[PDB]
Amino acid sequence: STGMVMVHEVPFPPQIITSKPLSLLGQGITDIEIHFLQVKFTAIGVYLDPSDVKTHLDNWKGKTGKELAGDDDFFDALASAEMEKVIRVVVIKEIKGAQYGVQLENTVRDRLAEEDKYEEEEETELEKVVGFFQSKYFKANSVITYHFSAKDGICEIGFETEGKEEEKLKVENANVVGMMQRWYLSGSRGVSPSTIVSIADSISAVLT
């Protein structure tokens, strides 16, 4: 309708409208070096409302993108902030959904255990997220979306692929929802350093 933003040759809508318009403030990819070369697995887009950024992260105004990208307290504040966020992930390298699911599980479980926040309630919820992804095949251009509610720690996961009606999963465990968000939104521990740098630069501009 209004064009698409190309993130590593993958189209992303400039905005996504939930309760209000959210702008693509962060973009990047997840990759791994194999045989001396960069292998791109997914393209990522993080959507936030600039007004929410101004309302909840005003304490970081004046900071440069470089300063924000190197500060985990900033990203913890972004994750803790009661404003919605949408994380859109498009598959570049086709893989079994289980590969993505177990990577998520590994990091989320490890971090929750580190904070002594991994009991049977969290384990059960996390297993449902893993089960959601393992029943799917990630063809290139398949889209995974994470919609984080502003409050009450809720996340709705969506999976869309050509030919099938979109599939969704509602996650309600606050600890799991919070750590899933931090899997992407983490200064030094984010799965996509490129997206982190991008978000930092955008928010710096928003607050400046």
Chain residues in the site for Ca ion (CB under 5 A):
119
Considering the complex, state which of residue 173 and residue 204 has its C-beta at the smaller distance from Ca ion. Answer: 173
For residue 53, the Cα-to-chain-centroid distance in whole angstroms is 16
Nearby residues of 187 by Cβ (< 8 Å), 6 or more positions away: 69, 70, 71, 72, 74, 75, 196
Smallest distance, Å, CB 180 to Ca ion? Answer: 20
User: What minimum distance in Å lies between the beta carbon of 117 and Ca ion?
Assistant: 11
Give the helix/strand (H/E) hosting 31: strand 21-34
Query: In whole angstroms, how close is the CB of 125 to Ca ion at the nearest point?
Result: 12
Q: Which residues pair with residue 6 across a beta bridge?
A: 11
Residue 94 vs 119, nearer CB to Ca ion: 119
At 27, the amino acid letter reads Q
CB of 175 to Ca ion, least distance (A): 12
Nearer to Ca ion among residue 30 and residue 173 (C-beta):
173
Q: Which residue, 30 or 175, is less far from Ca ion as judged by CB? A: 175
Least distance to Ca ion from the beta carbon of 118, Å? Answer: 11
The residue number whose beta carbon is nearest to Ca ion equals: 119
Pairing assessment for the beta strands 167-171 and 155-160 based on DSSP bridges? antiparallel
Closer residue to Ca ion (CB): 59 or 124: 124
Cβ atoms of 94 and 139 closer than 8 Å? yes
Structure tokens at 162: 């050509």
Element spanning 86, H or E = strand 85-91
CA angle 154–183–103, rounded 5-degree value = 110
